[PDB]
Amino acid sequence: KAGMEGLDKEKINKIIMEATKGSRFYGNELKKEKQVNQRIENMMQQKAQITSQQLRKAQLQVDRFAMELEQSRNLSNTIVHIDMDAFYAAVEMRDNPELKDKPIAVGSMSMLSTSNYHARRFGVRAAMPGFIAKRLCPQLIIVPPNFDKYRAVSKEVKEILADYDPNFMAMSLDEAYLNITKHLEERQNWPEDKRRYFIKQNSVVFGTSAQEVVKEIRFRIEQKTTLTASAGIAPNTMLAKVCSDKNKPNGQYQILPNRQAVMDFIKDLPIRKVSGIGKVTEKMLKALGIITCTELYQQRALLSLLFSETSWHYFLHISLGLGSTHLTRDGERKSMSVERTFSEINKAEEQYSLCQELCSELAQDLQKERLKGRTVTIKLKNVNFEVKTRASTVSSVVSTAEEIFAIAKELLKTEIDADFPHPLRLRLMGVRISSFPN
DNA sequence: GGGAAGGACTC
DNA sequence: CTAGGAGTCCTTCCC
Ligand SMILES: [Mg+2]
Ligand SMILES: [Mg+2]
């Protein structure tokens, strides 16, 4: 909940529930929770069959591993995570001044991509459907998303970022990591005028410290675009991101570059505030008595024998406050996809032609990157939100509508057939091309 | 070690 | 169109 707290979680939760109670969605949502409780159940079973000598041995490895990490802990880099405030809303408020005074969201009546802060006061958030949102805030204006407009402001701000780190990596249209470690060195020798900017006396000079260079960035960002950003400063990416939210909107937070600072932050940081730990992992760990990053580190024993090698390796990093100190600046796309949810469709005649408009639309997007690919996956979703997913890869490549529809046509047919005589009651369909030459 | 199927997570 | 769409990475399962 990254914005408004101190909310009437009673009148809000009641409304959300009344508008979800007997829904077809909530039904599936309930079966999911059952499925997640089962998963916990097998974990809790696996736990019950561990012997203290088994556990004790785990302690040896994990502590040795820890010790290795701890020795290669890097506190030399200053990483900044920039995170625009209520981004899609804000852009729209900028574009259309009228809206600047009221609660608004960007999305549809059936789903919100975000919502400006005034609306968050009513508990209106992203991922929440616009019709529930409107019940929370009957005067909410929902604005349709216009990605071209958002991409502009994105590259409008990416222009400020390159100054402080030509190598900065963007994560989305409103987020990027910067490693200002090198800028911070050169900046120590910068005279006033090189760090003095004219407002909207009318001028300010920014200091020489990381804290200031980030104030300066945020300032330039607000002045050039009209929008406000928040920022996190810390030794590595994982912390920098947690920090960029500690003071939203329009503020910033630093963890100073020393072990203890890190350690003091982490201590009581709820594990869910970390990027990559979701709703499920939270619940699974809460089940083992794990809520804060301290509790996560103290169970490093158990974790290495209940979870995939990659999950505990990862969990351990977080528990010790480690993260990336080096922005990969990688890239290259793994897949491209087009999918669409719609008022029910059970007629195979249209199911086939929807798959065509999709395959066809995909081809064009795929075309603009001049990309070609071997694998093709369709994705159908019942009227009950159950999702199927059927793949097929050929051995040539395939690129245009007709050829990509060629394969998707068939995959669709097999599932219509598989359920015959009963037709497939669909709310969603989608088509994903992947495995590109490389 | 190249598939296919289902999911967790995040924006 | 009255619970999105887009993408990546993982976990498991078979030649
Ligand atoms: Mg943001
Ligand atoms: Mg999280």
3-state secondary structure A24-46: HHHHHHHHHHHHHHHHHHHHHHH
Pick out the nucleotide with least CA–C1' distance to A391: B4
A429: left (phi over 0), alpha (psi -120 to 50) or beta: beta
Cβ < 7 Å from strand B, A residues 110-129: 127
Give CA–CA dist A317/A66, Å, rounded. Answer: 8
Looking only at Cα atoms, what is the longest distance across chain A? 79
- Judged by its nearest atom, the ligand closest to the C-alpha of residue A1 is 2
> How many distinct helices (H) and strands (E) make up chain A?
17, 14
Which structure tokens are listed for A72? Answer: 């290669």
SS3 A83: strand
Dihedral sign for Cα A213, A219, A224, A229, please. Answer: positive
Q: In whole angstroms, what is the distance from residue A279 CA to residue A385 CA?
A: 19
Among A73, A43, A75, A68, CA closest to A299: A43
Burial zone of A227 (CB within 10 Å; 0-12 exposed, 13-18 middle, 19+ buried): buried
Yes or no: say if A216 and A80 are a contact pair by the CB < 8 Å rule.
no
Bridge-based pairing state of the strands A141-143 and A104-108: parallel
Evaluate if the CB of A28 falls below 7 Å from strand C: no
Round to whole Å and give the CA distance between A2 and A16: 19
For residue A19, give the nucleotide whose C1' atom is nearest its CA.
C2
A33 is catalytic: no
* Residue whose pair of structure tokens reads 């694998």 in the numeric block: A375
- The reply to whether the CB atom of residue A280 sits less than 7 A from any atom in nucleic acid chain C is no
Quick one: tokens of A139?
């005067």
Choose among A324, A52, A286: nearest CA to A181: A324
Q: Experimental method for this entry?
A: X-ray
Strand (E) positions, A288-399?
A: 335-345, 375-382, 387-393
Q: How far apart are CA A430 and CA A424, in angstroms?
A: 14
From A135, A144, A126, select the one nearest A20 (Cα to Cα): A135
In order of start, what are the domains of chain A with their CATH numbers?
Answer: 1-77+259-326 (1.10.150.810), 78-85+145-200+203-258 (3.30.70.270), 86-144 (3.40.1170.60), 329-438 (3.30.1490.100)
Give every CB contact of residue A100 below 8 A, 6+ residues apart in sequence: A93, A94
CA nearest to A80, candidates A207, A217, A177, A215: A177
**Burial letters for A403-416: b for 16+ Cβ neighbours within 10 Å, e otherwise?**
ebbebbeebbeeee
What phi, psi does A346 have (nearest 5°)? -115, 0
Query: Which ligand has the nearest atom to the CA of A238?
Result: 2
List the alpha helices (DSSP H) in A72-194. Answer: 87-95, 117-120, 130-136, 147-164, 181-187
Residue labelled with tokens 């109670």: A21
Looking from the CA of A53 toward its CB, the CA atoms found within 13 Å total 0
Cβ atoms within 10 A of the Cβ of A234, count?
29
What SS3 class is residue A222? helix
**From the CA of A257, how far away is ligand 1's center (Å)?**
25
Token digits for A307?
């979870």
- Distant-in-sequence, close-in-space partners of A171: CB < 8 Å, separation ≥ 6: A177
A5 assigned binding-site residue: no
- Cis before A257? omega within 30: no
**DSSP code at position A417:** H
- What's the Å distance between residue A7 CA and nucleotide B3 C1'? 49
Q: Establish whether A386 is an annotated binding residue.
A: no
Between vectors from CA A270 to CA A248 and to CA A49, what angle results, nearest 5°? 155
Q: Is position A83 annotated in a ligand binding site?
A: yes
- On the question of a cis peptide bond just before residue A235, with omega within 30 degrees of 0, the verdict is no
Q: Dihedrals φ, ψ of A3, to 5°?
A: 175, -100
- Say whether the CB atom of A59 is under 7 angstroms from strand B: no
- A427 CB less than 7 Å from any atom of strand C: yes
| Interatomic CA distance for residues A286 and A280, integer angstroms | 10
Please tell me the distance between residue A284's alpha carbon and the centre of ligand 2 in angstroms: 13
For A116, which DSSP code? -
A123 dihedral zone (left: phi>0; alpha: psi -120 to 50; beta): left
**Nucleotides in chain C with any atom closer than 7 Å to protein CB:** 1-12
Report how far residue A196's alpha carbon sits from residue A198's, in angstroms, rounded to the nearest whole number.
7
Sheet holding A111-115, edge to edge: A111-115, A104-108, A141-143
